[PDB]
From a paper:
The Drosophila tumour necrosis factor (TNF) ligand-receptor system consists of a unique ligand, Eiger (Egr), and two receptors, Grindelwald (Grnd) and Wengen (Wgn), and therefore provides a simple system for exploring the interplay between ligand and receptors, and the requirement for Grnd and Wgn in TNF/Egr-mediated processes. Altogether, our data provide insight into ligand-mediated activation of Grnd and suggest that distinct affinities of TNF ligands for their receptors promote different and non-redundant cellular functions.
To uncover the organizational principles of the Grnd:Egr interaction, we first determined the crystallographic structure of the extracellular portion of Grnd. The proteolytically defined Grnd30–81 readily yielded crystals diffracting to 0.92 Å resolution. The structure was solved by S-SAD, and refined to a Rfree of 0.16 and good stereochemistry. The structure of Grnd-ECD consists of an N-terminal β-hairpin followed by two C-terminal antiparallel α-helices, with the 8 cysteines engaged in four disulfide bonds, with a topology that is reminiscent of the CRD fold seen in structurally known TNFRs. The C-terminus of the Grnd-CRD folds in a C2 helix-loop-helix module, organized in a nested pattern of disulfide bridges, according to the consensus sequence Cys57-x3-Cys61-x6-x5-Cys73-x3-Cys77 (where x is any given amino acids, and the subscript n indicates the number of residues). Although X2 and C2 modules are common features of TNFRs, Grnd-ECD is the first example of a TNFR fold combining the two together, with the side-chain of Phe46 fitting in between the two. A major finding of our structural characterization is that, in spite of the poor sequence homology, the ECD of Grnd adopts a cysteine-rich domain fold consisting of a X2 β-hairpin followed by a helical C2 module, in a combination that has not been observed in TNFR domains so far. The reciprocal orientation of the Grnd X2-C2 modules resembles that observed in single CRDs of human TNFRs such as TACI, BCMA and Fn14 and the fourth CRD of TNFR1, with the conserved Phe46Grnd side-chain packing between the two.
Author numbering: 34 to 81
């Protein structure tokens, strides 16, 4: 996962499509281009 990198636990998640840390705000805000309800829920929602 993410080549061993540990991402920010609240602000980020390890996106395994890219194996990079990606911002939670982006995936959770339904006004963004990369909003993803499922990934927000799974990877971000409970940590904030």
């Amino acid at each position: 996962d993410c080549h061993g990198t540990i991402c920010h636990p609240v602000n980020e998640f390890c996106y395994v499509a890219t194996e990079r840390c990606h911002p939670c705000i982006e995936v959770c805000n339904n006004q963004t281009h990369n909003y993803d309800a499922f990934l927000c829920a799974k990877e971000c929602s409970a940590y904030k």
